[PDB]
Write a structure and sequence with these properties.
monomer, mainly beta, Lipocalin, ten-stranded antiparallel β-sheet, globular, secreted, glycoprotein, disulfide bond, odorant binding
Length: 159
């Protein structure tokens, strides 16, 4: 059951897996890029803040990190500081299957977007993935800038 607004944030908590990653600047999400991090779980706090626990590669090793995201004034939007100021929202979710987040990173040099699909399981339906691709094309992210992480190291081994 697919939700596209009025998200019930309580239902996005718990464990997720990073499945697709996309950006309008490809380097951001390729190996070594600052945005190539692999979600573990999302914790929702009493003040509506969210804590993303994730893994990133540090000298070849999966290292746990924690991202604090705060609700902005604007509805559905969150901000988080990581390699700049990021504003993000939920595009779509089936709470027990997948979720798609859109993010704008603002920085002195060049704004970029990210799009990410997480699954409750390590993989999701190829239909869902195609739907993520079309959302990306609508946002001027070309399909060549869309990485599927199911057959690469995404720190599953460190979870």
């Amino acid at each position: 059951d697919v939700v596209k607004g009025n998200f019930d944030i309580s239902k996005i908590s718990g464990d997720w897996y990073s499945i697709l990653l996309a950006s309008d600047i490809k380097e951001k999400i390729e190996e070594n890029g600052s945005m190539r991090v692999f979600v573990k779980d999302i914790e929702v706090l009493s003040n509506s803040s969210l804590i993303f626990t994730m893994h990133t590669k540090v000298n070849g090793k999966c290292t746990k990190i924690s991202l604090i995201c705060n609700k902005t004034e604007k509805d559905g939007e969150y901000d988080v500081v990581h390699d700049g100021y990021n504003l993000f929202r939920i595009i779509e979710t089936a709470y027990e299957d997948y979720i798609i987040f859109h993010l704008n990173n603002v920085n002195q040099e060049q704004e970029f977007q990210l799009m990410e699909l997480y699954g409750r399981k390590p993989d999701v339906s190829p239909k869902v993935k195609e739907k993520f691709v079309r959302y990306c094309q609508g946002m001027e992210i070309p399909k060549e800038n869309i990485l599927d992480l199911t057959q690469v190291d995404r720190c599953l081994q460190a979870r």
